[PDB]
Amino acid sequence: DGVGNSSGNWHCDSTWMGDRVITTSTRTWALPTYNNHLYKQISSQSGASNDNHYFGYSTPWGYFDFNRFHCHFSPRDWQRLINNNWGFRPKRLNFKLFNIQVKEVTQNDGTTTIANNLTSTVQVFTDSEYQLPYVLGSAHQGCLPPFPADVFMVPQYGYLTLNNGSQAVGRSSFYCLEYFPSQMLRTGNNFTFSYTFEDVPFHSSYAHSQSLDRLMNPLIDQYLYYLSRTNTPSGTTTQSRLQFSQAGASDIRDQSRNWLPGPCYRQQRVSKTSADNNNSEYSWTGATKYHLNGRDSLVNPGPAMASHKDDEEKFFPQSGVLIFGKQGSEKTNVDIEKVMITDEEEIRTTNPVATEQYGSVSTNLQRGNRQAATADVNTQGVLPGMVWQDRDVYLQGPIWAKIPHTDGHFHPSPLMGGFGLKHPPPQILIKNTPVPANPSTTFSAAKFASFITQYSTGQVSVEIEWELQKENSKRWNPEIQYTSNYNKSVNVDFTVDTNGVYSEPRPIGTRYLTRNL
Amino acid sequence: QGPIWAKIPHTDGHFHPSPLMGGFGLKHPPPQILIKNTPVPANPSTTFSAAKFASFITQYS
Amino acid sequence: LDRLMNPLIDQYLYYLSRTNTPSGTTTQSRLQFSQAGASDIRDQSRNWLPGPCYRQQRVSK
């Protein structure tokens, strides 16, 4: 209402009550004019490799992105969550846009001037029928910034469709977003909508205190037998004789078991110590990849697998983990001290190590003159009796992904981590309404190319309720908790420096508490 | 001679959780029933000692 | 106030009972600790202090 009344108030806090936590984040955003109000066909460059070809469209619209956990949880909030809860999941969200300001920019005479345009509008619509290509869930920049005092730029919306090389095909779709209905907002108007999450499984924010190969009573023998010797000493040599034993603690690898470890898709191993790696360019040639319509894509991060085995923390899968950048890290070819490499070590209780074989299978039929032969299994699809953990989530990491619209999707938990949703939180798209500049006094049928330079700013609030599954642990000894480091330092972790720059010093997962298998 | 049920492991994903040795996979199997004889201390000293008792009456049930 | 404990039982807390130990022909600095019982009743950990003081000169009858 009017011009002198704010359309909303600042809400940032977390409310912990019972099995629920509610997070609220308010930020200040700025929206420019994109593409000078045009839709543009875009494509890969002429010299691009086949694996890098694309075709699509850039739009004049922007969109809002709060699909990272930091956007909602403070570092102290994240600690409170991960130290006390076995699981959590999102329930509902609220979204608000308010305190909208449109401003005119006159760059005349090399001097910039900025004035309020109290009459201009912004257009906002939710894609609640999921009729546009969903580009959230691709881990793009442009989120609400983790620190509440920071002002962020709204990212530009674009999408890809079917390409053959740099060219489109008959099935390529083009979308005009102005062909949707949208709200027009003038200074003093606000925008709200609500969303309910579908029923989704809790994220498992625990590690297992048991391993799948150690589930039996070590004090008692099995009543089942296994083949323990295939020959026996006969005089001066051996002869073929099959012999059988019941497995106890002494031969614990040989016990009959009910379950199998999860599936595998083997990754190459790289060392954080530089001298242990081969002196060669293998970042692509040695990469784990999939092949789709004659194209190779890197499998990154791929299926959830343990980063390393015991005492090998310096090793990680080539493209098998999420890697976050440190504050101020650049885009291209940075050193390893500039990035933060997550560790999925916790899931090695049930999941194969990413850089090892799944196991060994028999390849032949032995006999008197043929010895038994085995082969390493480097790729293992799911088997009946397999169990596994999903990838962990991080404070820096994504929250949800849209499950692709397909006939079949096995265990549709997104591989970068988080909650797979058939109807995710809808895309919220926004743009400044074009305001034409001074027209000619003689009619012209050509479209207007001359506009008044404008941008918008405002406040955005996002409120998410989360359902908690509290830890109820009967173990006697104390557990592992996330804690801040104990010593003195120049800067405090998760703080601003003397220049006002907020930084996140390390990745924080969720799995600190333990449970039995 | 074989087993009847197994406990399905507590995990994010488990495809066709029928136990491989055979039988019925159960997310909540028949619970473990644990039993022990309550320790009965033997003749204690007549001067107090803070050490824990190591001497008991031999019992079975 | 300095005699409030059970004289029959030792304390589980420790106090510093020796600051040096005989080493060859001399002593060397070595900190040693004991639990206080009835034999060293002045050394027991206590919860309370005597009241305040404002010292007077002593006169004989």
XYZ file of C-alpha atoms in Angstrom, chain A residues 124-354:
231
model
C 6.826 -12.393 -10.616
C 5.357 -15.833 -11.190
C 5.780 -19.295 -9.743
C 5.995 -22.237 -12.115
C 3.733 -24.385 -9.991
C 2.751 -26.751 -12.818
C 6.439 -27.429 -13.589
C 5.931 -26.421 -17.206
C 9.369 -24.800 -17.575
C 12.748 -26.555 -17.616
C 13.813 -26.942 -13.995
C 17.343 -25.595 -13.581
C 17.353 -25.662 -9.814
C 19.075 -28.762 -8.578
C 22.058 -28.318 -10.897
C 24.273 -26.788 -8.166
C 24.484 -23.306 -9.660
C 25.752 -20.154 -8.017
C 23.366 -17.350 -7.179
C 21.924 -18.666 -3.932
C 20.815 -16.494 -1.082
C 24.172 -15.734 0.578
C 24.978 -17.654 3.768
C 25.711 -14.545 5.769
C 22.584 -12.462 6.421
C 24.193 -9.035 5.961
C 25.224 -9.718 2.360
C 23.349 -8.397 -0.669
C 23.115 -10.727 -3.640
C 22.426 -10.422 -7.349
C 19.516 -12.382 -8.814
C 20.822 -14.929 -11.353
C 19.677 -14.949 -14.960
C 17.389 -17.760 -16.084
C 18.213 -19.900 -19.094
C 17.663 -23.433 -20.274
C 18.807 -26.062 -22.744
C 16.826 -28.203 -25.149
C 17.703 -30.945 -27.633
C 20.787 -30.252 -29.725
C 22.507 -31.920 -32.647
C 25.912 -30.307 -32.537
C 25.283 -26.591 -32.108
C 21.953 -26.905 -33.935
C 18.424 -27.567 -32.755
C 16.261 -30.497 -33.842
C 12.553 -30.824 -34.559
C 11.806 -31.747 -30.955
C 13.522 -28.655 -29.514
C 11.162 -26.541 -27.415
C 11.148 -22.787 -26.995
C 9.416 -21.157 -24.029
C 8.204 -17.577 -23.755
C 7.872 -16.866 -20.055
C 5.589 -13.897 -20.673
C 3.118 -16.485 -21.954
C 2.495 -17.323 -18.343
C 0.359 -15.211 -16.000
C 2.399 -13.260 -13.480
C 1.922 -10.704 -10.734
C 2.941 -7.113 -11.409
C 4.359 -5.376 -8.338
C 4.831 -1.643 -7.783
C 6.610 -0.089 -4.777
C 4.411 -1.057 -1.852
C 3.212 -4.363 -3.263
C 4.425 -7.658 -1.888
C 4.480 -11.238 -3.106
C 3.847 -14.395 -1.093
C 3.300 -18.069 -1.684
C 3.326 -21.292 0.308
C 4.533 -24.774 -0.537
C 4.159 -28.168 1.113
C 6.839 -30.802 0.659
C 5.778 -34.292 -0.323
C 6.376 -37.158 2.051
C 10.101 -37.853 1.800
C 12.367 -40.143 3.790
C 14.405 -38.590 6.568
C 18.031 -37.962 5.760
C 20.139 -40.321 7.854
C 22.310 -37.950 9.892
C 24.127 -40.786 11.675
C 26.996 -43.137 10.958
C 26.839 -46.846 11.658
C 28.723 -48.272 14.626
C 28.632 -51.718 13.002
C 29.946 -52.993 9.700
C 27.920 -55.255 7.444
C 30.574 -57.983 7.575
C 30.626 -57.894 11.405
C 27.053 -58.590 12.532
C 27.318 -61.992 14.203
C 27.852 -63.061 17.811
C 31.643 -63.563 18.068
C 31.231 -66.078 20.903
C 29.109 -68.689 19.111
C 29.842 -70.823 16.067
C 27.553 -71.131 13.078
C 25.702 -74.356 12.394
C 26.242 -73.909 8.646
C 29.308 -75.250 6.860
C 31.596 -73.781 4.233
C 34.180 -75.429 2.002
C 37.457 -74.857 3.846
C 39.905 -77.181 2.071
C 39.845 -78.521 -1.472
C 42.855 -80.825 -1.192
C 44.656 -82.747 1.512
C 48.230 -84.045 1.841
C 48.439 -87.554 0.398
C 51.789 -89.238 0.890
C 54.350 -87.083 -0.902
C 51.789 -84.859 -2.667
C 48.194 -83.678 -2.304
C 44.989 -85.210 -3.600
C 41.612 -83.621 -4.278
C 39.463 -83.882 -1.150
C 36.652 -81.495 -0.244
C 36.462 -80.547 3.425
C 34.017 -78.428 5.363
C 34.051 -76.325 8.512
C 31.664 -74.335 10.642
C 32.746 -70.698 10.828
C 33.469 -69.065 14.169
C 35.441 -66.013 15.264
C 38.744 -67.484 14.075
C 37.534 -67.573 10.453
C 35.098 -64.687 10.545
C 35.502 -63.831 6.846
C 33.964 -67.197 5.923
C 30.652 -66.869 7.759
C 27.331 -67.241 6.000
C 25.661 -63.838 5.849
C 22.298 -62.421 4.816
C 23.228 -59.166 3.106
C 25.441 -57.607 0.462
C 27.113 -54.193 0.246
C 25.611 -51.572 -2.028
C 26.328 -51.075 -5.714
C 29.572 -49.818 -7.194
C 30.824 -47.817 -10.178
C 34.559 -47.693 -9.787
C 36.467 -44.398 -9.538
C 40.160 -43.686 -9.990
C 42.127 -42.866 -6.848
C 44.050 -39.598 -6.418
C 46.306 -38.608 -3.512
C 46.242 -35.274 -1.732
C 50.022 -35.609 -1.492
C 51.224 -34.467 -4.907
C 54.132 -36.896 -5.257
C 51.971 -40.047 -5.138
C 50.141 -39.234 -8.384
C 51.182 -40.107 -11.914
C 52.910 -37.379 -13.903
C 50.486 -37.274 -16.828
C 47.173 -35.764 -17.939
C 44.527 -38.276 -16.875
C 41.790 -35.982 -15.526
C 39.620 -36.933 -18.513
C 41.222 -40.066 -19.999
C 41.185 -41.741 -16.591
C 37.791 -40.372 -15.593
C 34.671 -42.350 -14.786
C 32.117 -41.629 -17.452
C 28.787 -42.421 -18.928
C 27.793 -42.379 -22.580
C 24.525 -40.816 -23.752
C 23.610 -40.327 -27.420
C 27.224 -40.472 -28.524
C 28.416 -38.085 -25.806
C 30.609 -38.695 -22.774
C 29.693 -37.108 -19.459
C 31.834 -37.187 -16.347
C 30.175 -39.164 -13.558
C 30.347 -36.641 -10.763
C 29.931 -37.379 -7.896
C 28.198 -40.563 -9.000
C 26.879 -43.345 -6.778
C 27.451 -43.035 -3.049
C 30.668 -44.852 -2.163
C 33.227 -44.553 0.605
C 35.976 -42.055 -0.164
C 38.789 -44.253 1.175
C 39.443 -47.204 3.423
C 41.071 -47.218 6.866
C 44.168 -45.040 7.280
C 43.962 -43.759 3.692
C 42.404 -40.335 4.350
C 44.841 -38.770 1.864
C 43.123 -40.622 -1.002
C 39.845 -39.618 -2.622
C 37.938 -40.661 -5.748
C 38.819 -38.636 -8.835
C 35.272 -37.383 -9.433
C 33.565 -39.224 -6.572
C 33.111 -36.498 -3.918
C 31.727 -32.998 -3.630
C 34.444 -30.344 -3.683
C 33.688 -26.885 -2.320
C 35.776 -23.793 -2.848
C 37.317 -21.768 -0.077
C 36.318 -18.135 0.249
C 37.726 -16.170 -2.660
C 38.668 -19.182 -4.772
C 38.640 -18.686 -8.519
C 36.952 -20.487 -11.376
C 39.739 -22.207 -13.307
C 42.606 -24.521 -12.341
C 43.075 -23.641 -8.690
C 45.418 -25.482 -6.349
C 44.211 -28.082 -3.880
C 44.727 -25.647 -0.995
C 42.017 -23.481 -2.582
C 39.306 -26.157 -2.410
C 37.653 -28.255 0.290
C 37.277 -31.969 -0.453
C 34.487 -33.732 1.421
C 35.017 -37.154 2.973
C 32.359 -39.855 2.642
C 34.361 -42.208 4.893
C 31.422 -42.840 7.247
C 29.487 -45.082 4.859
C 32.213 -47.694 4.427
C 30.290 -49.837 6.920
C 27.801 -50.680 4.162
C 29.082 -49.088 0.970
C 32.045 -50.176 -1.172
C 35.055 -47.889 -1.271
C 34.805 -45.799 -4.432
